[PDB]
């Protein structure tokens, strides 16, 4: 005989997901989908690696401000499907 039972209409171990880009000004891009607390640096390390560059040689921005190694889609107050920007730097050389 069948071992059947109805299951209760709650699912407490869910979380929220959000879709973020990381985009360079060479038009180079990665789509990601992360939980609303997941750190943005995990996305920005992987971008920087597939480009081959040192994370040191680059700045990052969103909605008018910098991103830190700990900012989250909660911390920045982000709505879904947005873009993070990446940027180069130009110190040294002949003055």
């Amino acid at each position: 005989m069948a071992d059947e039972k109805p299951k209760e209409g709650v699912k407490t171990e869910n979380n929220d997901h959000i879709n973020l880009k990381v985009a360079g000004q060479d038009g180079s891009v990665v789509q990601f989908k992360i939980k609303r607390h997941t750190p943005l640096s995990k996305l920005m390390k992987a971008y920087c690696e597939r480009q081959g560059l040192s994370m040191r040689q680059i700045r990052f921005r969103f909605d008018g401000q910098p991103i830190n190694e700990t900012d989250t889609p909660a911390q920045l107050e982000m709505e879904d499907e947005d873009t993070i920007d990446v940027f180069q730097q130009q110190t040294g050389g002949v003055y």
């Binding site: 990665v30 990601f32 992987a46």
Partner: peptide, 13 residues
């Protein structure tokens, strides 16, 4: 084709 990476941040044995 590979412009896609999937990421979360809680881990344990």
């Amino acid at each position: 084709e590979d412009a896609f990476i999937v990421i979360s941040d809680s881990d344990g044995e």
